[model samples]
Target: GSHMVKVSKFLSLVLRHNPALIGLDLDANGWAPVKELLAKMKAKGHGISMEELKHIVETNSKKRFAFSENFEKIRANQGHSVEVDLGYEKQVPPAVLFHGTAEKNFDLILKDGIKKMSRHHVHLSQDITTARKVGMRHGKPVVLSVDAKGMADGGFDFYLSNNGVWLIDFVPAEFIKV
Candidate 1:
């Protein structure tokens, strides 16, 4: 299981942000052939088996990666710094959402608001627990409320990922509350 976790993180790095690192190419929808990925990983000395890869994808707590219907290809659910599109449809968000970040980042976040930074979209959570978990990744966690419905009504578009992550191009300062 521990090995699977490490492999999952490695897969996230390759599939979501740095396919070129492994000489793998994602299609327009961010999918790479499973065979290609396995071969590349093996060449790089990772040597993960298809069964192991499937185990990692299936058992991942975040549900971050997925295989295509026929299981020939795979991709990350969201949080991509790379250019491939995931083909998510614009959605009408709920009345509110949440974002979590380190407490130390509050100053810059309050001044500039939350930006996407590197990934294509700013990720949000529908619940505070999830947001807090995300925030805790950086440091002391702080949850910020987001007026999601207001943003949508004001012409912003929201997208829901396969793993249930909420995504927006950016969240303005006015819509966020610490």
Candidate 2:
């Protein structure tokens, strides 16, 4: 289990941020050819078999990575720091959404609102429990409610990722309840 977690984090690092770390390349949509990925992993002395790879993807609690229909390609569902289009479409969000962050960031988040930072979009959760969990990762969980319906009504766009995360370009301060 520990080894699998390490491999999962390694995969996230390569697939989500720097593919070049392992001399691998993700296409414009953030997908890497499965065969090439395997080869590159082996070349980098971290060889992972197809079955293990599939197991990692299937068993991940976050459902972070996905395989192409033909199993010839793979990509992170969201949360990419590197440039790549996830091709998410605009959709309606629930009346309320939530963002979780550390108390240390609360003031800045209130002042400047929530920014995507390095990632392509600001991620939100539909439930407070998830938001709290996310916030706890940083420190002292602070959950902020988002006026998702108002944003949508005001012409802002929203997208739902394959892993069920809500995505938006940004959240204005006025729509965020600190």
Candidate 3:
């Protein structure tokens, strides 16, 4: 009894993008009760259940969601547009990272470099292939290399999201490579 579309979209919609629609204010770290989340889903027309929810978290493809131990709470790993701190600590990144964007962006990026723009931090990919995939989603895929190691040695900061993506404050022009 599913639409055959990706179930993770609703999960992303509430868990990461718009938690307030389902009363996600219950916790500071964006953690909501597993049962309560299902309760809200039930109140609406979503056919997701606790067992299905468990599967969604396990097989979310991107592994973007997590359930707390004892199965008490559920929360998003990263990419929250809202100000829900994921408790991400300082972590040194790889010597180089990748960013996926459309070829159209090179104009702005070549001059001003990258900025967080909407989200809290710039999302850096762990691999070039991953970056290319991300770029394709925006438009004509273009993989940009980040001199993260060079940036790090210069006193920049990086944080690793739970799902293994790197996060950074800014990427000045010098730290980027065409």
Candidate 4:
């Protein structure tokens, strides 16, 4: 709890999803004013200074957060439950991608394909190692190889986040190692 991880989680919630929780509001483009954010965090006893915020963002390998140019604002790169555009441009993906899900969700995923039911997009990774790690979060590690090129050929759109994470609306069963 003493490490930066604690502040990172709090920052994730406030910056990525629920600014409302701390009585702060983000712009339509999802940029929260850095000054106000720190103030709100302090009011909630988060004890987050600018140095602490920068430390959390720079140290985390997840790459989910970013600061706007000139450090005036901050925003989440992707994975928003509340609606806010991260301004990612459309990009073509590689031939194949990987998705790791817990074995517990495979039954439904295999049947329904990867649906963006909760998250804004079905997060796809280029490496199996990352995929398996994502799968581990669910339960048993199961990796599904995705035909990203095939999906694009079929007219599906792909967006690349600032973190290099590929974002897609859906992945049908036929496009994966079904």
Candidate 5:
């Protein structure tokens, strides 16, 4: 059996559902280093030019995206944070997860906003195992489905710290095209 090598994308394309979000963990169990991540991307044929990648890194030099409650007013908050509870008619692909101050409201927001994002992509599993698998293959830390039952609500969630257990922004979904 051949395991498909995961590729890296410079950007992410999220299928909105519920109040989903995207996040990368930055805790003690942090992610892969930049060199390893670049190697993975090259192996997967990302075709990202050095200049372009350099530009992206430089642009983010002054930004520190966090999942803390105070994160909203601190940085520009490029990611999302939401709350609500709503059911769905079906499932889709590329489900996402989030990490927030409180885990209680994550699912509530997802239930409420899932329908809108469902119209875009398919849904995956509702658990960390499934999300981790998708994250590994897709080269993204985490993406959300409209389900909303993880750390946060609508989008996928990830930790921004570097504990050396996972990969952060190794391959964003935007770099991949159907």
Candidate 6:
């Protein structure tokens, strides 16, 4: 349920700044599962469709959105750490912390101090050819934050949608500023 609350808060904040962030607040759970979230918006008579959602996640990787740079390393991990926690049947780990680098404070983090990527998802690739193919779909010359651990790194490699959304298969450090 905690993830739900975090999702809601995140959506609310984003919606406040960009009404297009979410279609509707159906069920009032604060965090609606992707299907429900999409349904709610559609029920409201909005013109959204499943393909649109895919497009949003797929296309946003093309452009770089403004965010902090401190959390890029943490963001690179994607959710592999979550799997580790669940493998041991342990309590869900705390959400990673992310802090903005400047006066804008335009960043998100967990209480423990790890930085979070701009999105929770990630894209997987095994080679430069694949990486470039995915990156170019959103737009060529894509920008990315520095990777802290080159060897242990893991994160999404994706393209951006046309609507300025980060269309992430898996969110990555390149997506977040910090």
| Model 6 RMSD vs true structure | 16.7
Candidate 1: tens digits of C-alpha lDDT, residues 25-131: 77788889999888778777777788867766665513457787677998876442221222334555446777787878777778877764623456766678778
Better of 3 and 6 by TM-score: 3
lDDT of 4 by residue, 1-178 (tens): 3434335445665665677877877788888888888777777787778877776666551355677657788775544222122232346545577777777777777888776562345576666777777667766657777775554433344567688676766666655884
Candidate 5 similarity to native, TM-score: 0.24
Candidate 4 wrongly placed segments (more than 4 Å): 1-88, 118-120
List, residue by residue over 65-152, the lDDT tens digit for candidate 6. 1111331110001213222121112122133212112222223211212233523332333333444455565444232332322211
lDDT, residue 131, candidate 6:
40
Pick the winner on lDDT between candidates 2 and 5: 2
lDDT of 5 by residue, 75-112 (tens): 12223333211111222223343211122323533444
Distance from true position, residue 130, model 4, in Å? 1.6
Q: Which portions of model 3 show Cα errors greater than 4 Å?
A: 1-88, 118-120
- Stretches of model 2 off by over 4 angstroms after superposition: 1-88, 118-120
Per-residue C-alpha lDDT of model 2 across residues 12-44, encoded as one tens digit per residue: 556667777777777898888878777777676
lDDT of 3: 0.61
Question: Which candidate number maximizes lDDT?
Answer: 1
How well does candidate 6 score on lDDT at residue 71?
A: 16
How well is each residue in 54-130 modelled by candidate 3, as lDDT tens digits? Answer: 77666542345677767788876544223122232446544577777787877787777766461345776667777
